[PDB]
Amino acid sequence: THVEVVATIAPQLYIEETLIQKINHRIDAIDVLELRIDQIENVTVNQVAEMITKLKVMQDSFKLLVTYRTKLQGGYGQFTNDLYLNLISDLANINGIDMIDIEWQADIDIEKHQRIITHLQQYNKEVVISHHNFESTPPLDELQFIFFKMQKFNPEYVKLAVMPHNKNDVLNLLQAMSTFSDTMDCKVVGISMSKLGLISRTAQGVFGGALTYGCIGEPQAPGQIDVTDLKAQVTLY
Amino acid sequence: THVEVVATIAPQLYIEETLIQKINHRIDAIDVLELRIDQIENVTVNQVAEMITKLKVMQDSFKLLVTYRTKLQGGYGQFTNDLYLNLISDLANINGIDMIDIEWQADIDIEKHQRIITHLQQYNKEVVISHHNFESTPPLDELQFIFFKMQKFNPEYVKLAVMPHNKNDVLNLLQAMSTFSDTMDCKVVGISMSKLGLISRTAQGVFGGALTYGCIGEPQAPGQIDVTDLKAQVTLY
Ligand SMILES: *C[C@@]1(O)C[C@@H](C(=O)O)C[C@@H](O)[C@@H]1O
Ligand SMILES: *C[C@@]1(O)C[C@@H](C(=O)O)C[C@@H](O)[C@@H]1O
Ligand SMILES: [Li+]
Numbered sequence: 339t340h341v342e343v344v345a346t347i348a349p350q351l352y353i354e355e356t357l358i359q360k361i362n363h364r365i366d367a368i369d370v371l372e373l374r375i376d377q378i379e380n381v382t383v384n385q386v387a388e389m390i391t392k393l394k395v396m397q398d399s400f401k402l403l404v405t406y407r408t409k410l411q412g413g414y415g416q417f418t419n420d421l422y423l424n425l426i427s428d429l430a431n432i433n434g435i436d437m438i439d440i441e442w443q444a445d446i447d448i449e450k451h452q453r454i455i456t457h458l459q460q461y462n463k464e465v466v467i468s469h470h471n472f473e474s475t476p477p478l479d480e481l482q483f484i485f486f487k488m489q490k491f492n493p494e495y496v497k498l499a500v501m502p503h504n505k506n507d508v509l510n511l512l513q514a515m516s517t518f519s520d521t522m523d524c525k526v527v528g529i530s531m532s533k534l535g536l537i538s539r540t541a542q543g544v545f546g547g548a549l550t551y552g553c554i555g556e557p558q559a560p561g562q563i564d565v566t567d568l569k570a571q572v573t574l575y
Numbered sequence: 576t577h578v579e580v581v582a583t584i585a586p587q588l589y590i591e592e593t594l595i596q597k598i599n600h601r602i603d604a605i606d607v608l609e610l611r612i613d614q615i616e617n618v619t620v621n622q623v624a625e626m627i628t629k630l631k632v633m634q635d636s637f638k639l640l641v642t643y644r645t646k647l648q649g650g651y652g653q654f655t656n657d658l659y660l661n662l663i664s665d666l667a668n669i670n671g672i673d674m675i676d677i678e679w680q681a682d683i684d685i686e687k688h689q690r691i692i693t694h695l696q697q698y699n700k701e702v703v704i705s706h707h708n709f710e711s712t713p714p715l716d717e718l719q720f721i722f723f724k725m726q727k728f729n730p731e732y733v734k735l736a737v738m739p740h741n742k743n744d745v746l747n748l749l750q751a752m753s754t755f756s757d758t759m760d761c762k763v764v765g766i767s768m769s770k771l772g773l774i775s776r777t778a779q780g781v782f783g784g785a786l787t788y789g790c791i792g793e794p795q796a797p798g799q800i801d802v803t804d805l806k807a808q809v810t811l812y
Contacts, residue, residue: 509746513742516742520742536812537774537778537812
């Protein structure tokens with residue numbers, strides 16, 4: 339496994355020259371730029387397209403992933419489910435997007451999720467289907483079943499982010515992703531959050547995961563480190 | 576856990592000034608200098624004492640560990656068991672030694688091992704009781720039982736080094752050391768060898784282990800990295 343390094347950013351509507359300078363300073367470390375958008379209250383596809391245009395010089399160095407992380411999965415986004423899913427579907431129309439995050443949880447409308455995913459894939463977008471538990475790390479068998487349900491949508495990536503309470507929870511997440519990687523077709527990404535889980539981010543490739551997320555400024559999630567230091571780590575394993 | 580970094584050396588009877596200079600150049604990275612001696616055919620306590628003087632160990636720089644690794648546990652040492660154990664016991668008489676490795680395996684004479692360990696401890700030596708499997712990684716429960724048997728001798732450290740052939744084997748070693756660390760009094764050290772196991776060496780402290788072994792020149796065991804890079808890694812977790 340060669341792990342791709344994802345740099346998470348979270349600008350308001352007007353992306354600042356100072357952010358552009360920070361990205362450029364880390365350019366060799368960035369395989370994917372993750373534009374978070376849930377922090378933009380009442381964000382529209384038009385506004386997203388405007389932001390993407392400003393990040394079109396370094397297009398040649400990285401893929402662009404757009405993520406709207408809902409409040410209930412630990413982000414800022416307060417859209418109702420229908421507005422959220424309408425946003426995700428509309429992102430297909432932006433040419434400069436390469437990857438799109440869509441959230442999985444137990445209450446989703448399956449056939450609708452599959453219609454959206456098919457739609458994004460028809461538009462040549464890579465789909466990351468994601469699930470987050472900021473409270474705890476379910477037991478091994480449960481983490482595996484979550485991976486199982488997410489992969490039935492035939493995404494390009496399945497991503498599971500969980501919060502460890504102890505060392506065993508960290509090892510369970512690593513085991514879940516390792517067993518998935520050895521047995522299943524699509525790419526997997528596991529994150530054990532917080533300082534305790536940092537090893538999941540640095541040794542992600544050892545256990546067969548495809549992406550690791552870091553930051554440019556402050557951590558955008560518990561345990562994130564700067565992408566320059568993250569790239570150096572990934573290269574060691 | 577603050578992990579101590581061990582630098583493994585394996586010189587001939589006459590230690591060359593060039594080695595001493597390499598050690599001194601890495602003094603900030605070295606908490607323990609491990610003088611391997613099994614590579615000296617028919618080595619005596621007198622010859623070990625001569626080599627120790629030749630190191631000219633400076634006050635307050637690193638602890639000195641002396642290790643005779645037997646051929647059957649993956650070293651070079653061809654001593655019969657009685658000669659081996661007589662060597663281990665005689666090491667107590669060398670003032671400059673701080674720590675001594677003694678090997679555990681299923682067929683040991685327990686009461687004799689305990690007599691020797693008590694003896695070393697009466698001489699103010701820290702005892703590292705160690706076990707190595709260069710072939711494979713036993714299952715979790717077996718790794719735990721090995722740790723259990725080794726700790727009954729009330730050593731200062733229990734050390735288990737095993738060879739992974741897949742991701743689950745690496746995770747099993749990490750789980751065994753973590754559970755030991757959480758439940759038992761004495762210090763624990765775990766090594767999953769080879770490149771696949773490198774994470775056990777760099778994230779040792781995450782899982783509660785007390786030592787991590789690296790090299791000066793060439794790797795002295797599969798997966799070792801240079802102690803300067805090892806110290807930097809330990810500091811990240
Ligand atoms: C995928 C994701 O939730 C992982 C977070 C992390 O823990 O690094 C960062 C988020 O920006 C990201 O969408
Ligand atoms: C403890 C020990 O057997 C571990 C080896 C390793 O895998 O780094 C190095 C040996 O010198 C050492 O005694
Ligand atoms: Li690392």
